[PDB]
Amino acid sequence: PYIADCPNCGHSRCDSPIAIEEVRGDAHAGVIRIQTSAMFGLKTDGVDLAYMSFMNGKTQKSIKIDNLHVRTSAPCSLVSHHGYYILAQCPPGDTVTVGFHDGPNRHTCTVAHKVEFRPVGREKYRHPPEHGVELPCNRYTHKRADQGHYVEMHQPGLVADHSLLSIHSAKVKITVPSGAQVKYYCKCPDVREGITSSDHTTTCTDVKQCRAYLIDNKKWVYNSGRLPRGEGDTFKGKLHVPFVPVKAKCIATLAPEPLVEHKHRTLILHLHPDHPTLLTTRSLGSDANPTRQWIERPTTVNFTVTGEGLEYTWGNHPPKRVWAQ
Amino acid sequence: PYIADCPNCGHSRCDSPIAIEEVRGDAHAGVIRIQTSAMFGLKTDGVDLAYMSFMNGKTQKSIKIDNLHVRTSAPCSLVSHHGYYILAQCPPGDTVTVGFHDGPNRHTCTVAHKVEFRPVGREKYRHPPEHGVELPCNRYTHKRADQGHYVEMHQPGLVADHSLLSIHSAKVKITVPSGAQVKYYCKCPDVREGITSSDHTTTCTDVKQCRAYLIDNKKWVYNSGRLPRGEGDTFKGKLHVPFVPVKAKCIATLAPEPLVEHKHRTLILHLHPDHPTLLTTRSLGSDANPTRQWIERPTTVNFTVTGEGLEYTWGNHPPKRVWAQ
Amino acid sequence: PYIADCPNCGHSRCDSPIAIEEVRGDAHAGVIRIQTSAMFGLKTDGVDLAYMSFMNGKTQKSIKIDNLHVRTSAPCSLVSHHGYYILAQCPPGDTVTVGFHDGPNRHTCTVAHKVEFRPVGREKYRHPPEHGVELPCNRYTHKRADQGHYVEMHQPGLVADHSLLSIHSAKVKITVPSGAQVKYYCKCPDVREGITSSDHTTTCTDVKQCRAYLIDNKKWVYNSGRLPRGEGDTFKGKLHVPFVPVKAKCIATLAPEPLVEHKHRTLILHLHPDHPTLLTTRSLGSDANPTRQWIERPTTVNFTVTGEGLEYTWGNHPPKRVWAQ
Amino acid sequence: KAGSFGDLQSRTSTSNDLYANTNLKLQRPQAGIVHTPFTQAPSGFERWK
Secondary structure (H helix, E strand, O other), X not given: OOOOOOOOEOOEOOOOOOOEEEEEOOOOOOEEEEEEOOOOEOOOXXXXXXXXXXXXXXXXXXXXXXXXXXXOOOEOEEEEEEOOEEEEEOOOEEEEEEEOOOOOOOOEEEEEEEEOXXXXXXXXXXXXXXXXXXXXXXXXXXXXXXXXXXXXOOOOOOXXXXXXXXXXXXXXXXXXXXXXXXXXXXXXXXXXXXXXXXXXXXXXXXXXXXXXXXEOOOOOOOOOOXXXXXXXXXXXXXXXXXXXXXOOEEEOOOOOOOEEEEXXXXXXXXXXXOOOXXXXXXXXOXXXXXXXXXXXXXXXXXXXXXXXXXXXOOOOOOOEEEOOO | OOOOOOOOEOOEOOOOOOOEEEXXXXXXXXXEEEEEOOOXXXXXXXXXXXXXXXXXXXXXXXXXXXXXXXXXXOXXXXXXXXXXXXXXXXXXXXXXXXXXXXXXXXXXXXXXXXXXXXXXXXXXXXXXXXXXXXEXXXXXXXXXXXXXXXXXXXXXXXXXXXXXXXXXXXXXXOOOOOXXXXXXXXXXXXXXXXXXXXXXXXXXXXXXXXXOEOEOOOOOOOOOOOOOOOOOOOOOOEEEOOOOEEOOEEXXXXXXXXXXXXXXXXXXXXXXXXXXEEEEEOOOOOOXXXXXXXXXXXXXXXXXXXXXXXXXXXXXXXXXXXXXX | XXXXXXXXXXXXXXXXXXXXXXXXXXXXXXXXXXXXXXXXXXXXXXXXXXXXXXXXXXXXXXXXXXXXXXXXXXXXEEEEEEOOEEEEEOOOEEEEEEEOOOOOOOOEEEEEEEEOOOOOOOEOOOOOOXXXXXXXXXXXXXXXXXXXXXXXXXXXXXOEOOOOOEEOOOOEXXXXXXXXXXXXXXXXXXXXXXXXXXXXXXXXXXXHHXXXXXXXXXXXXXXXXXXXXXXXXXXXXXXXXXXXEEOOEEEOOOOOOOEEEEEOOEEEEEXXXXXXXXXXXXXXXXXXXXXXXXXXXXXXXXXXXXXXXXXXOOOOOOOEEEOOO | OOOOOOOEEEOOOOOOOEEEXXXXXXXXXXXXXXXXXXXXXXXXXXXXX
16 A cells, blocks of 8 residues: 655645545546555455555555545545545546545545546536436446556655664664665765664764665555655566446436427427537538537527428437428 | 335445435525435334334334435535425535435435525525525425325335245245235246235246235335336325425525715616626616616626616615606 | 524524634635634643533533534535634635534534635636645634734623523522622512522512523623623723734646747747636737736637737746747 | 725724725614624725735
8 A cells, every 4th residue: 555645635745645646537427536545455465355455654554444535526426446546436526535534533635636527418417317318428347357457566665764763872773664675874974775674873863864764665556656766676566457447338418308399491499408408400401501509598599491401419319300391 | 114216326226215206406495305215204103203214125124313414516404304205405406415324334315406596586695694684485394294285195016025035945935024915926837916925836946037026005105206006006195295385584685785876867886796696777767778687796887867766676685766866 | 612693503593602703715725714602722721722612501511622524515624723713724615614513413503604715826726736836825824823913802791591590489590600690680670680699589480581691701702793792891801813814825826838839920829727827918018918818718829929029927837928029 | 985996994004093985784683683784895805806
């Protein structure tokens, strides 16, 4: 579970494990795929997707997911998590605002991202309905058995941990997690690399002038922009994405039927939608003479139909056609 | 407590007991009257409106209301429940989104419905204030002692319950709730009606080709569109509605006073509202020459007042009048 | 912790201790400074800002802050509390809606107030981002060590408490909190001032025709409009405000860079913002010929640049300049 | 003029005296409840921004 710098972490820029990168309000189904720097899913070892492992300290905390909250302008709905990554059904929102509850603390993370949800169709809803026609939307999956893409996930760079740099009663005293690789020296001249167990520091004294580092590359990370490079190498760790964008047919929009009214080679149409509906036509002469107008306000319109025919498209309701001799 | 098919029940179309029908964002007071298919109120038997009976299984669960949530674009405020029906003060919202918390599960239900709250008045607020004039809004009651209308509530049709169709070690085995009427046969030829205690099935074997039905018409239901008809009869069960729309005087709107400025037979009016305010006038000559314009942006306007008089309507603030000789 | 009359206290006008006055959505940083009539902060006596003292009864209740909720159109984020006063990061909202949870009851308070958050800059965002330039916004502090202003806070007037007016088995019986000053008489003729311990009432009998008053001016209050005057005097109690508006440099806005395109003494500019951006220019001739237009929709624009130069202001992005010979 | 720019007009920040044409008009509180209807133009400093 990677940890990075959340931008407006409740107060201001903290370093949250759930630091939000790559917000994708690019689908249609009310859904956003998000990456936390935290890797929830199974535990550290082997069990139960519905548990929760973020970083506390240098360490993980692979425990229950109890009170996740993604949210935006309104509280979102989770869809599924896998890896670093969560899918959640959100409404539109100027921002994105994520957070669980460990239990002692709220411990959330928030971010800017322009979000919208147009459904696919000539109706510009704000939200998916219960009914209407199905038609080919873009949307992310529920599932994990997924390989359609993979993002590079090589090592972490080092990280700071000044909990290490204690004092040896006059000298600044570094320690190690588990024998991990601590990269160490101070502004003064003393040990210059640091690949060690718990060292002391002969020369410097102040904690604030030393290299508290953790080369702990036993587990790779996501290659966040808010990661410091592991300077050594491009280690392996090519790793999939679960939530591929797929060609789901969203349960989708439909605009109320029109009121057809006859006139001489002319369609008066008293019209009354639910939401802004893009109407358009095609006078089937080799003179096309089409028309487009989003209609949200109910409006009686007109169409000079010709002899050979016109067609009529009340939103994603199917196209009509008309003989006006 | 009826159970029907919620349309976007967290994931997708579940069958929630709180399946939302008949959303009514038709009043003014920030209020919506809703019908769940669930009948909260008293328990199964006799006590305490503030308890909570939905259907779990074929069975009720008449327990506490602890964590109801109606919500929309924002979380609503409950007003009162009675029967199948709840009143709740909501803001505007493209949708309506309802849900309690049983305790082990969220178990919510959500729906599309165009909601708005215009207050009555020439001010187009988004929300009721603390002050302003009172005037005759439309609104639903708090109370239950109500008979002003009644909706038909006859029986339920059957329902599926394949928990019944167990296996008699080689044959598919139906049982009964309490001696209820189970309507049974399979694709093969065996018992053809089913009005029985726990039967077996001589002929068919597969659970997936049999009639797991529950004619359990000891308690009527609401006549939801998401109900299957009880084919036998229009049984009795005419049943009231609590939340009648009544002629409450909402605590209501008021727009800031105008800045009256004199000119020669002309009212300059530097004007500065809180919200979009429909201003309008009536030049009291037999030439009416009225004007209408919603004003939300502060605007210095003008009015060619005549000799005999004009009147002036700063929102639902009372109408003024003016001698311009 | 003062108690006043909340306007739409869940149901309607209650008397909440957290009665909201002086909403100030006048800064830029997503923040509002609010005054509850309740004085949270330290306890009654001496400890821990993060505890919670409102009025229950005539009495305080100095306990934990556990589940505060300020909110608007969305749930806000607390920033800090001090005294009667809380700072909280909110989004825009037609209203303001505040409330904690004592534990047995929700016990909230809500109010009307027009809120917005323009960030300082020619970009009209709806929300502060993670990045962009810093520039001089107006904003309130986190802190308490604050004297930049002080509001008058003299005594409370009396308050009603008909829990006092019990019955002495035939006569209406007043009591006292702790020897506090109870101001008493009834419509009938009996004791006419009331500065006493627990009195009886010789003359009247009905609780509903007597003066249940509490002159309990051992602790001053905020001078809310929803306070009854302490008729005696302007007692002392000049008391600071914590949350002064200060000249913080908000982490602030930035609009995506323009696409500069050359023409003959003419800047075509295909342009594509994130949010509505006020663009403007100054043809540096003594003929200024400036232009202003908020741009939210991407637009290819044009500028007849002169010989001597023009300047160009893509939002709060710094001003550009151009030689068009 | 109230609503227009300079509804509040203080010589300086310290100056306790000022000119406040805000058209502040109090109205009676409603239905026997304690509060203070203050009906007022939001400032000509609110607009002007």
